[PDB]
Amino acid sequence: GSMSSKSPWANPKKANAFMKCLIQKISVSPVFPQQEKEDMESIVETMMSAISGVSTSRGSSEATLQAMNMAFASSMAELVIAEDVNNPDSIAEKTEALSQALKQCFRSTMGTVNRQFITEIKHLMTMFAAEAAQEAAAGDNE
Numbered sequence: 001g002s003m004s005s006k007s008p009w010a011n012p013k014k015a016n017a018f019m020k021c022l023i024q025k026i027s028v029s030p031v032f033p034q035q036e037k038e039d040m041e042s043i044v045e046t047m048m049s050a051i052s053g054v055s056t057s058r059g060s061s062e063a064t065l066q067a068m069n070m071a072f073a074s075s076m077a078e079l080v081i082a083e084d085v086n087n088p089d090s091i092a093e094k095t096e097a098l099s100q101a102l103k104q105c106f107r108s109t110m111g112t113v114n115r116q117f118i119t120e121i122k123h124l125m126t127m128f129a130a131e132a133a134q135e136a137a138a139g140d141n142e
Contacts (some may be wrong), residue, residue: 004110004112006110006112007110008065009065015051017109018105018106019072021108021109022101022105023044025097025101026101027040031090031094047072050068051068072121073125074128076098076125077124077125077129080094081129084132085132085133095122102118
């Protein structure tokens, strides 16, 4: 909103709602296969496990905020890499859906249209996928 506290992963309570919001959108599987849902479910449990590992409930750290934020993007990026190499067309549709999901999820949580996280996530996702794709292309050379 006009004035809102920037507590993305800082507050697990809102983090859970934010994550579930994005997770459920993906779980809809309108274009992506339900196979990814099972992997995603494992990722969600792992991310929650990681949070538990970081702290039982009370505790915070800059390392955690950055590592977990990067970790969420990295896990999605890994899924993106597989889809990108196998079929980049899917990525275009998938990113459009994700863009919509991010906008709706952020507005439904923090209610802030900051695209700093979106830009960072997209940048890392594109950078990681691009690098991976180049490696995949190099591996599958002629």
